[PDB]
Design a protein around this ligand. Structure first.
Ligand code: RET
Length: 137
C-alpha cells in the first residue's frame, strides 16, 4: 500500500504523559509538546522497505528498515534500541524495541494508514499510549 508521503501532524494526544513515563522533567515536556506541533513525517515505501524522516523545527532524524529485519534506532527519549517491525494487517505495522544498554520502560510504536487517508502513529511506554494523527501535505 501507500505509506509514502509527506505527512503533517493534525492531532497529538497523551504525548506529555508519554514523556513523563520516560523520565523527562516537566519544563522539557512542555517545550517538547510545543515542538510536536511543528512536526512532519516523510515516508518512502517500496514493498516492505521503508525510509522514514521525522523532523521538527531544529532537528531531523532518518529511519531505514525492512519489515521483519532487526535494525537499530532510538527510543522516543533518545536511548539507543534494537527494533523489529512486523505487519499486523494490510495497512498497520508494529515495532517492538529493546534497549541496547540498561533498563527502562517497555516501548513500542505502530503506524497505520486509515481508510480516510490519515496516518496514525502510536507510541507506547508501559501503560501509556500516545496517539498522533497526520494528513498528507
Ligand atoms: C514511525 C514513526 C516514528 C517512529 C516516529 C517517531 C517520532 C518521534 C520519536 C518523535 C519525537 C519527538 C520528540 C522526542 C520531541 C519533539 C517532538 C517529536 C514529536 C518530534
Amino acid at each position: 500500500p501507500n505509506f509514502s508521503g509527506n505527512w503533517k501532524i493534525i492531532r497529538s494526544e497523551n504525548f506529555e504523559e508519554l514523556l513523563k513515563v520516560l523520565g523527562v522533567n516537566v519544563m522539557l515536556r512542555k517545550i517538547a509538546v510545543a515542538a510536536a506541533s511543528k512536526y512532519a513525517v516523510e515516508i518512502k515505501q517500496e514493498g516492505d522497505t521503508f525510509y522514514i524522516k521525522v523532523s521538527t523545527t531544529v532537528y531531523t532524524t532518518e529511519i531505514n528498515f525492512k519489515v521483519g529485519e532487526e535494525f537499530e534506532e532510538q527510543t522516543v527519549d533518545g536511548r539507543p534500541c534494537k527494533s523489529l517491525v512486523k505487519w499486523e494487517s494490510e495497512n498497520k505495522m508494529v515495532c517492538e524495541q529493546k534497549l541496547l544498554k540498561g533498563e527502562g520502560p517497555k516501548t513500542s510504536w505502530t503506524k497505520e494508514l486509515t481508510n480516510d487517508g490519515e496516518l496514525i502513529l502510536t507510541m507506547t511506554a508501559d501503560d501509556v499510549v500516545c496517539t498522533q494523527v497526520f494528513v498528507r501535505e
